[PDB]
Amino acid sequence: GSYDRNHTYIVSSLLEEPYLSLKQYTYGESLVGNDRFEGYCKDLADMLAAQLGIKYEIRLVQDGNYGAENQYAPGGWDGMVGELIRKEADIAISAMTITAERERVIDFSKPFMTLGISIMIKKGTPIKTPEDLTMQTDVNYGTLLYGSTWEFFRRSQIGLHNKMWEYMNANQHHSVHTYDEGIRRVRQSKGKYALLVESPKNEYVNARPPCDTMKVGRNIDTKGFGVATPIGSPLRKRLNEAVLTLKENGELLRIRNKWWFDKTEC
Numbered sequence: 001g002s003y004d005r006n007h008t009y010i011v012s013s014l015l016e017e018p019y020l021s022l023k024q025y026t027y028g029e030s031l032v033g034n035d036r037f038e039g040y041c042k043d044l045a046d047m048l049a050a051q052l053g054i055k056y057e058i059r060l061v062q063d064g065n066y067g068a069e070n071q072y073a074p075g076g077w078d079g080m081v082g083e084l085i086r087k088e089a090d091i092a093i094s095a096m097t098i099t100a101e102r103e104r105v106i107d108f109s110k111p112f113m114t115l116g117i118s119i120m121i122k123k124g125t126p127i128k129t130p131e132d133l134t135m136q137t138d139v140n141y142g143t144l145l146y147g148s149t150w151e152f153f154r155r156s157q158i159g160l161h162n163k164m165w166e167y168m169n170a171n172q173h174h175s176v177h178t179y180d181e182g183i184r185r186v187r188q189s190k191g192k193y194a195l196l197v198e199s200p201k202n203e204y205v206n207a208r209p210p211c212d213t214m215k216v217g218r219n220i221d222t223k224g225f226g227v228a229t230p231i232g233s234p235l236r237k238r239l240n241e242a243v244l245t246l247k248e249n250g251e252l253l254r255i256r257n258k259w260w261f262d263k264t265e266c
């Protein structure tokens with residue numbers, strides 16, 4: 001009650017199914033505003049906004065990126081993280097991974113979803129573990145360039161992860177600027193490409209047509225997605241409280257089931 005509720009809060013996000021996607025276009029109907037979007041993060045944004053009694057406007061991130069340290073970006077970060085640092089958005093509500101490096105420059109709520117880095121292959125590919133990737137030649141691999149998975153491997157102290165880092169950094173052409181390009185490569189490379197991809201994305205894709213991909217191995221780490229705000233945001237406490245409210249009252253579980261379990265489909 002001591003924050004501006006007339007302001008339409010600007011929410012940075014990023015199209016990434018099923019977290020956020022465009023509603024299917026139809027004949028003679030033009031969608032505008034937030035009505036253009038659907039998905040888990042749309043539903044989450046709606047609920048958070050209702051908890052806080054605020055209006056919001058989704059504005060997709062202007063470089064299509066999650067956020068990385070970049071010696072060219074103003075404020076030192078690109079993507080959604082940079083939009084928050086530079087106060088171009090009020091909140092980011094996306095599948096944004098909570099990392100130690102990002103916590104030094106923006107704030108996160110407690111996590112609304114858990115996840116881990118995982119491996120996606122085309123069915124038939126002879127890979128069962130991360131170790132396997134480093135012990136063979138014909139299957140190339142990669143991940144989303146410069147995002148949290150990229151940084152995990154760069155920074156990990158585990159020999160295996162460092163081995164995978166050295167490979168990917170020396171073979172950046174086998175990594176991708178969107179998960180959808182990586183998934184296309186899995187599907188089109190005849191068993192010769194594996195994608196390092198966060199588990200909720202992996203699980204979603206594998207349970208939907210064309211049913212030609214699968215997850216192998218255990219998750220490599222354990223991680224969360226959080227609602228992010230610029231430091232100092234008057235909304236920081238109330239947004240964290242709202243996430244905890246939605247967690248406790250079963251609403252996060254309900255929309256996770258809506259977009260993952262209710263969409264299977266394989």
Ligand SMILES: N[C@@H](CCC(=O)O)C(=O)O
Pocket residue numbers: 066067095096097098143144146147148149150196197198
């Ligand atoms: N969720 C990741 C993007 C995907 C990835 O890095 O695998 C991030 O916030 O950077």
